[PDB]
Design a protein around this ligand. Structure first.
Ligand code: PGP
Length: 104
């Protein structure tokens, strides 16, 4: 089993660890990367009832195992907060518009 599933994108929690971690170091340095420049705040326009406390942050997770390093965000994503606490795994895949659904 994969700790989180976004459609067909199965991901172990370890994977999850190395994505948010990465994205949090870039958040620390205050640096931004990407056309859609990640990391950036994720406002919760969808409103999932999260354990973690806002302010939350959008950051891409690739199914290939590597970290976001510019380019393609793909469609799945990890959201941390200011104290690197994990709020979740949301994905475009399966919802409509530019929605995100939590990854089971
Ligand atoms: N679906 C969604 N997209 C978000 C959220 N927060 C940011 N984004 C996306 O990231 C883009 C870049 O981050 P931004 O929110 O800082 O601009 C946003 O432009 P928008 O603000 O117009 O939504 C939006 O398209 C959110 O809570 N939900």
């Amino acid at each position: 089993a994969c700790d989180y599933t976004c459609g067909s994108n199965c991901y172990s929690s370890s994977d999850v660890s190395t994505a948010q971690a990465a994205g949090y170091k870039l958040h620390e340095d205050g640096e931004t990367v990407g056309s859609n420049s990640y990391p950036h705040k994720y406002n919760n326009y969808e409103g999932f009832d999260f354990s973690v406390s806002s302010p939350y942050y959008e950051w891409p997770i690739l199914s290939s195992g590597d970290v976001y390093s510019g380019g393609s965000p793909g469609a799945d994503r990890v959201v941390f907060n200011e104290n690197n606490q994990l709020a979740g795994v949301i994905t475009h895949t399966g919802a409509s518009g530019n929605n995100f659904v939590e990854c089971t």
